[PDB]
Design a protein around this ligand. Structure first.
Ligand SMILES: Nc1ncnc2c1ncn2[C@@H]1O[C@H](COP(=O)(O)OP(=O)(O)O)[C@@H](O)[C@H]1O
Ligand SMILES: Nc1ncnc2c1ncn2[C@@H]1O[C@H](COP(=O)(O)OP(=O)(O)O)[C@@H](O)[C@H]1O
Lengths: 53, 53
């Protein structure tokens, strides 16, 4: 009984941990995409911006 | 739902970026052509211009 309720609580902690890491991975990739989008936008702002070389 | 609307906005940004780059490429080539036309015109202005060697 002690091992089963211990293991159950630990399993709950494992599930929570995994869910949070899955979230973090999703958020990390969309930030990479938005960063790359910003970089692309900057290069167009440069070439098609004002005057210069 | 969050991933789909995020991805949709990012896809819109990608489409806009690509359209602007396609435009830039078109404009770049017609400028190369007009530059080369000007250079050709200059060589005729030289040979068939005034006096000299
Ligand atoms: N004569 C110019 N006109 C506009 N931009 C220039 C010029 N010369 C250089 N730049 C470059 O283009 C960028 C224009 O600044 P930015 O804030 O993007 O323009 P805006 O304030 O109109 O959005 C600057 O970072 C600068 O490095
Ligand atoms: N005697 C000359 N008459 C005309 N052009 C000359 C003469 N000697 C040299 N050139 C060259 O030909 C060019 C004539 O100048 P340009 O402004 O093209 O003529 P226009 O003002 O009649 O259009 C000059 O760049 C110059 O280098």
């Amino acid at each position: 009984a002690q091992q089963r309720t211990m293991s159950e609580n630990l399993r709950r902690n494992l599930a929570a941990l995994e869910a949070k890491i899955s979230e973090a991975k999703t958020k990390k990739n969309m930030l990479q995409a938005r960063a790359k989008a910003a970089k692309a936008n900057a290069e167009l702002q440069q070439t098609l911006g004002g005057l210069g070389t």
